[PDB]
From a paper:
Here we present high-resolution structures of the A- and B-capsids and in-situ portals of human cytomegalovirus. The portal proteins are believed to orchestrate nucleation of the procapsid through the formation of a portal–scaffold complex, which facilitates procapsid assembly. During the maturation process, the disassociated scaffold proteins are expelled as the viral DNA is pumped into the capsid through the portal located at a unique vertex of the icosahedral capsid. All three capsids possess a mature icosahedral shell and are distinguishable by the inner capsid material: (1) C-capsids are filled with viral DNA; (2) A-capsids appear empty and are assumed to be products of aborted viral genome packaging; and (3) B-capsids have a featureless inner core consisting of scaffold proteins, likely generated by an unsuccessful initiation of DNA packaging.
The portals from the A- and B-capsid resemble each other and are arranged in a symmetry-mismatch fashion different from that of the virion: a C5 10-helix anchor, a C5 portal turret, and a C12 portal main body. Unlike the six-fold symmetric portal turret found in the virion capsid, the portal turret resolved in DNA-devoid capsids with only five sets of coiled coils that were reclined on the C12 portal main body. Based on the high-resolution C5 reconstruction of the portal vertices of the A- and B-capsids, we built the Cα model for the portal turret. Each coiled coil of the turret contains two long and two short helices. The five-fold symmetrical 10-helix anchor in the DNA-devoid capsids was located beneath the floor region of the capsid, sticking to the P1 and P6 MCPs; this is similar to that observed in the virion capsid. However, in DNA-free or A/B-capsids, the portal main body remains in a C12 symmetry, with the turret of the inward-located portal arranged in a C5-fold fashion. Only these five sets of turret coiled coils interact with the surrounding capsid materials arranged in C5 symmetry. Five sets of two β-hairpins from the trunk domains of one Tri1 molecule and one Tri2B molecule interact with the two long helices of the portal turret at the upper region; five sets of the long helix, a short helix of P6, and two β-sheets in the floor regions of P1 and P6 make close contact with the two long helices of the portal turret at the lower regions. In addition, the portal of the B-capsid strongly interacts with the surrounding capsid proteins in a C5 symmetrical manner. We believe that, in addition to the 10-helix anchor, the conformation transition of the portal turret from a C-5 symmetry to a C-6 symmetry, which has only been observed in HCMV to date, would require immense inner pressure to occur, and this transition, in turn, contributes significantly to packaging HCMV DNA, the largest genome among human herpesviruses.
Numbering used by the authors:
A (entry chain g): 44 to 52, 61 to 138, 145 to 150, 165 to 290
B (entry chain a): 246 to 294
C (entry chain B): 1 to 49
D (entry chain h): 5 to 242, 255 to 304
E (entry chain I): 6 to 245, 260 to 306
F (entry chain B): 197 to 245
G (entry chain a): 393 to 588
H (entry chain M): 1 to 176, 300 to 464, 468 to 591
The structure:
Amino acid sequence: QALTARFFVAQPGALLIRMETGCDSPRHLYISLYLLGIRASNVSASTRCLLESVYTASAARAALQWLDLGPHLLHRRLETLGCVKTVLLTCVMLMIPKDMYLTWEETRGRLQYVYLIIVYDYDGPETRPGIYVLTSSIAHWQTLVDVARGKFARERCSFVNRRITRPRQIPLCTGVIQKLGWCLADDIHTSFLVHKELKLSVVRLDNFSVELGDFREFV
Amino acid sequence: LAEAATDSILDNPTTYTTSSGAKISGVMVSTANVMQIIMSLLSSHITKE
Amino acid sequence: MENWSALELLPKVGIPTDFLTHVKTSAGEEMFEALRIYYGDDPERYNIH
Amino acid sequence: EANIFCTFDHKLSIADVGKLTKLVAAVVPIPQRLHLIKHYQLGLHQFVDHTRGYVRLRGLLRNMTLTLMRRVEGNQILLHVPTHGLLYTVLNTGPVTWEKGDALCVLPPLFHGPLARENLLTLGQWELVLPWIVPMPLALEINQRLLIMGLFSLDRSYEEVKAAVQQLQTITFRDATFTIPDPVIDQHLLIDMKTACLSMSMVANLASELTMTYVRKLALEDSSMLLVKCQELLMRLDRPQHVSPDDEIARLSALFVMLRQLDDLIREQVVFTVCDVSPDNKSATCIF
Amino acid sequence: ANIFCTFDHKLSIADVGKLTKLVAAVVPIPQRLHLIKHYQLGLHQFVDHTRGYVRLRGLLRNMTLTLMRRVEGNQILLHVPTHGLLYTVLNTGPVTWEKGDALCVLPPLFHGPLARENLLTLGQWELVLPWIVPMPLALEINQRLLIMGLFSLDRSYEEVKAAVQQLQTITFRDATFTIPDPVIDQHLLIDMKTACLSMSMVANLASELTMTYVRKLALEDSSMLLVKCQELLMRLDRERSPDDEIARLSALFVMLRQLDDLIREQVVFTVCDVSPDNKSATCIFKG
Amino acid sequence: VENATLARQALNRIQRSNILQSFKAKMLATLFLLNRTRDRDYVLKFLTR
Amino acid sequence: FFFPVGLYLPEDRGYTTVESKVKLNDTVRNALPTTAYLLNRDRAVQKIDFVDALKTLCHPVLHEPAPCLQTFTERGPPSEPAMQRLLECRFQQEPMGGAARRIPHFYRVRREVPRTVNEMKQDFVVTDFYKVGNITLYTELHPFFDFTHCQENSETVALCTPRIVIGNLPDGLAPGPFHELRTWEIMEHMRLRPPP
Amino acid sequence: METHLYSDLAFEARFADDEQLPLHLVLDQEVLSNEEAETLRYVYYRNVDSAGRSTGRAPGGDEDDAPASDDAEDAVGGDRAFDRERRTWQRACFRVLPRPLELLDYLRQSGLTVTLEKEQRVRMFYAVFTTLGLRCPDNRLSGAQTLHLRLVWPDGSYRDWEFLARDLLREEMEANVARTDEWKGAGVSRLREVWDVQHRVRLRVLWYVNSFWRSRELSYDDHEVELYRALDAYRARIAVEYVLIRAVRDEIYAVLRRDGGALPQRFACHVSRNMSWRVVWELCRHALALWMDWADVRSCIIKALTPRLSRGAAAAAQRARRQRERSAPKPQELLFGPRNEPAEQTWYADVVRCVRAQVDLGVEVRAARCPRTGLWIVRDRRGRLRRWLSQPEVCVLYVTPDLDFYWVLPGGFAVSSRVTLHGLAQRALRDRFQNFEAVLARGMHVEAGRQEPETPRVSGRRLPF
Amino acid sequence: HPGFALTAVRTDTFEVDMLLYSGKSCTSVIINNPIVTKEERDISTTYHVTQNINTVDMGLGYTSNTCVAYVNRVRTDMGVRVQDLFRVFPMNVYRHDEVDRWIRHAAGVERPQLLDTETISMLTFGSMSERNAAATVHGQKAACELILTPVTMDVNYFKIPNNPRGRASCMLAVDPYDTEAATKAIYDHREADAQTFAATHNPWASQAGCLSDVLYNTRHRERLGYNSKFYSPCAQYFNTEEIIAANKTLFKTIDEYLLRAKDCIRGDTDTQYVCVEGTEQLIENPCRLTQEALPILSTTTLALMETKLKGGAGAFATSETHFGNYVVGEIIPLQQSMLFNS
Amino acid sequence: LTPVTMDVNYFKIPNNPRGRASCMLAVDPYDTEAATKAIYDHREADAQT
Amino acid sequence: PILSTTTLALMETKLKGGAGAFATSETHFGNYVVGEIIPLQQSMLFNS
């Protein structure tokens, strides 16, 4: 059930994320999901080094200019658009790296939803985000935020430690949960991909039905 | 196996009668290989009619 | 909970029978779902309401 | 994938299927979401267990999926999962009067009082217990009131808690009466109160120095009834120098998100919203 | 699921010629009836002297909202959207739309304006449409109205007047608005007053209830989050009967439940490709 | 052909395991036909299969 | 299917119904079984021993007698007053420095002490333990724990105490000759079957 | 480690209105059992001053210098003493780590740093962490102010430990960013064991060097006459049950002197003409002396008096007196009104045996009145009959919930009397064994009178999660 | 060899073709004309077409006799690999952490696992913790065991097909609708059992509250932390409430056998996971109806297995005994001449 | 070879001489991790013995 | 597996064997026999 547009910009499995530019002429920018792999801190350093090696542009330097401009405010600029039918390009309003994908079950529930999970660290100098994507079977939001509070207690401790050690600096949240649609339990498969003659470890989701959610802030 | 089963009471003595007066008194169904073992073992009693 | 009066009053079709075990053994050992074993003679089939 | 079949080990009499055919377009939850199911997981009686917690059932029935019963013809019940958006017709057995604007949320069936507890299908070990469909203000009042039962009653004897919750269990909403029987203090209640404590401490710390003194300024200025209520609620323990616009903007943003993560414990996302109620208050045509 | 609407008064040709410009825009209506008189249509029936804007937001949140489709002789083809399928709208909001945002619906803030809806009026009636603004500007201007109302109780001083004059301005992409005060002549509107009162008193109830409930909670299994919670409370403090606490907690919950037109801004649309002049945009109705 | 294995069916684990068991069984047991047995009915049944 | 491993057969009734068909070496790893040999799906020999059995025998659930103690309190005191006679023992606190002189003051009464249930479990042969003439079959519930009913403050309570040694296993269930056969095994494990 | 930080900060908080110090404690297997510590509900404390016997009562004197005087309806000064003694007990912070651990290695693996004079080995099996408060009334602290400490179990049973202030501070008084991270960084000064008063229980106290109590400049003195007054207070608090026992003993001797000893039969056991009774009389004397020897607080009359002290016994005594003071029934209430209705008694017993010199103290017994006669017949709590009235080598004492009395020699002959608590005051009888009613915590329902689920049971065998 | 001797209990599924025989005109078949149902999909249309069948069995008794005929494929391996008891009770750790790390190192399981909350057991049908290995040359595997007494006479007990718990627990032979006599028959030891006229044959297995009753009873395995997906083959013998529930009349008992008493086991994993709602296969059990189990060919020394494999016809069913060694002779000769005729 | 290795169920049954399974049918298709695990690795057993 | 003794006595008792004696697999004290599963010597040499 395709609902398409045209988006002024090789795999079909990409999530166009519309991030807001601090510069005033574009007012926004369409970054794909793989370039949060370079800002994530849960990821392996080798895959981060590979994506830093392949994708240096002037717009990548402006991307690091305008995402690290305002820290702990990235959820005010985070905005998804759905999946790619073909790559100017189009996007409907699934390729995932191996370490940014995680599951807290035996992933043996038949119908399972997907969920973008981000977290905000504070125990270092300022802020290190960690990008996740959570394939889970829970449908209701409160039970999901209970198991997220159960699985991410150290980030809550870091949140309250930032609120007690830097009183002039105000945080906003500890992260974002947001659904995107569902894949079944059988087409999820550890897999392989080579882009521009490079080895990168990818796990794929095949039968996706796109159905978005909202960026629900939680603690 | 034949004499252990009780006969039914919805009895139709017109249907399922062979030529030369033999009345059918049951059906014995199995797979390919068990039936061909029965045929290769008990071939003397088989009357293909 | 059934209408056994309809079983005892309505006109019936006859059958040749062959039970598996004895009939009273088929009564006391619950082979069917609904049974109405009364000994002697019961006049319960007459109060037509 | 859309129609869910089921079966019983019993057969179905004309009395039982006559009890059941009146329940066309009635809501029945499913724990599993599979194509063919058994009737020993249909409904809710697989999950009911008294002296375990009404709040555990409130957190558990919240997690099941929902279906609508129709087209019964003999060993086929045909639950039908509603698609996201089309107009459906439902039927409620939970005795609450409805309204064209009020949305709906599902609650486990509390006891109503008459010691009827109607189960409408009685088998050898399994009755059929049915989820209540109730309007949104009663759902919010139920959630906030059993959270009051949880949060208020820590470190107290049974006597003053008995005298409080004997009058606090009653909700008189639209000429009815209600009772919240099992508010028992579970680990689920402890993590709910822990999130409530964290959110209350955050909105107590990172709110402004001028929002704390707003009602004090209205006390010094104005006189109303709820102002007298605020003075009796706060007065027992009793020129702006600092101005900062953008810090107040970020402060209200943080106050908003922490109020939202306090409010999430009682406010469920809606499951049905009506377009018409039947005037004898039996069925309704609602969109979800 | 198509709606109709008839006007009782004489309707001219200039009024239709200025109304049919609004061929595809949102018009919220109080009850989903199949035929509705035009007095209920729109938002003119709600505005008055004493009540302000937060009342309009609260009644518009629980109100259903539909789409205007076509015009006829004296029947108006309103059409309620369905969840998931996509439609076209117009832009009555004053901000240029772009791709893929999330539109909100808020009551318009130009009450008694310089545009005056093209003099599309009848006898003691006027049509008015709500703004359709994307979400960051929506909850931004919600915060702006809120802390404009907070400063309103001591405004005799002059630096707070310049602070309010800063708050009255706004910034966006090629967008400057001047959203007027809730205060007019040394008094406040009652729904704005009860909104800021509800949030200030739930803040105070938190400030004098958390110091009880960290001790009434922490005698269970303690955590590092709990000692850091009392650390936060104790830095806040050193910076300086059942019958009462049951009322404190009940008033806590019911007064935080009066901010529900502020704390949750519920998305109603998803933007698709836009038009040149940025007045029209196909979109997906959500919720 | 001893089990339903039409060519569009994709096998799970235990099916392939008993297929391999039967591979080794019918490779060891019936490797050379006419050097082991000179029986009429065995070569008839084998050629029929 | 079911098959036993490691069973010890009685020796006084010992019989060999094969003598010419098989002949073995007299080392006692062959004159006392400890493992079993079975058949696979294909007809092949395979070993089942205690080495694979530590995936079940070394579990924390095997060593908890609290369900056994709860069900022994549930099905609690015995039936007959004829079996109230063998079930009295006391766990008190006596100052032992006084007891070192009070030992002749204990025997100055002339009333007999009844034997407890553990003494009642060793006056049976290995083939009479499994008959209805035996009394203590309602007590032998676990190979790691001894059970009894003993009156503390004059009420019969159930109590489980772990047999910390395997020597505390009763001789109807682990007899003397089996123990000496285990010693012959443990001497052959250290290459000492001729003793010095 | 965790609850020490919280309670230390909370005692920084509440120092303005209640002036106590943070006395952090840990305990071990030398005090409470693993089955007893796995299910431990909540700990309690209330410290006794040198001249005043509590804190929650009035500062100078009290009303508790009046005796109960063997009243019937008001058991011990009514029920105001119940809420008064409940008001003086405070609830303390609490945690149990139910797994084997080395304290120095556990605090080293956690955030703290140990700086001891020497690294001795404390091998303990499970650690329960709690903080109590010794109260400084002025800046001055008294060396005879003792600190009591309860351990409350979910059934309602409790043990009682208490200890003075000389053994808590025998050395640590004679040796004189955020808060949490510096508390973690500097940490614990040292560790020493503290004993109770009766040298029974060895538990350990933890002295943290980042305690704010070091910054209050507390003064201290331990005089001899204050320690002697604390010795007399402890003498009374130990002598309460024992003077009740002596009142029972001279009650039995006086009621034997009164009627001479030609005492009737009050229990249902047969007798034979031929058997001599000089032997059973000498056995009665020897066994009463033996019961005088092995007298203990865990006995029949004390556990019979424990549910007497609460408010429910006062309400049941009022309604039972109103029911037993009721006139002859009239036909007007018999014919139309609600009709009226004490099935079988709930006693306690001490059974003493002369030939084996073993008394058995805590016994429950359900008595019954035999229908054929006016005699008493005892039965077990399960339902079997009690055959100790056959044995000529035994004796048995009895006590009613009416607090009547039966001392029964072999043959069912009972020396009847009543208990005497005229010679005892109120405050010791309350604060020794006042029956405590449970407060709401995890695992229990809101309204009273409900079926209870399983305990929370913070477990040492299961994964605790 | 320690001071106890295990009896092992395993299950063994099969692929079997059973023939059937029914009398003439036994069950009338009632069919109808089919109905079509249109459904609107995105581009194309599916036409659901149904047809109903009613079947009136017109014999008094059972009119159709079937017989298990010919085994061809053995689905499991008939192996010896031990039931992974660490995965079925994932909660229970030892008290001391070092002895638990040392036991998990000396065993195979790498860590204690945390079993999920009950809502995930509602949404997902179960846990299924054990991961399938890379070797599947034998099939799926299961073998569990019962700790017994090492004196236990096999001659009365392990040669003939018998109950592995010691007491006869077949409620066909007891009075129907009598719970007290059933509990007196299968639990009381002041009177002998029915199979052999002795008390028991393994007193750690029969008593209500033994280790077998706290390791296998599904009424009593819920208290300690257990997993509902691993199929214990002894659970058909130790589930006491499931056994006393079948204490009925023999015709309703045989209808329970031919209708209800068929388990399902999932057929794509190498560990026997409990299938939920079998709609593609069904595992019928005669060894739950008869409440016994059959002895498999086991020896103790190699050379006695060699003299079994050296013999021919009529060799797998004898039962020889050396001095301390033994061989239990199987009663069903399926190891001898099922794969021999292949 | 190593001179200890058992022969009673290894050397007299059809078997692979490398020691392990190496059958390549019992593994899942197109899963090289489980392939190289079950041919080479030694934290697990073969499907044969 | 093919026929492989380790002492000549087992080869002699298999060369004196009439029919099917090649199928067995016998073991002495440390001296063994691998028995064939394909009866190859009997078949191919009985065909001569």
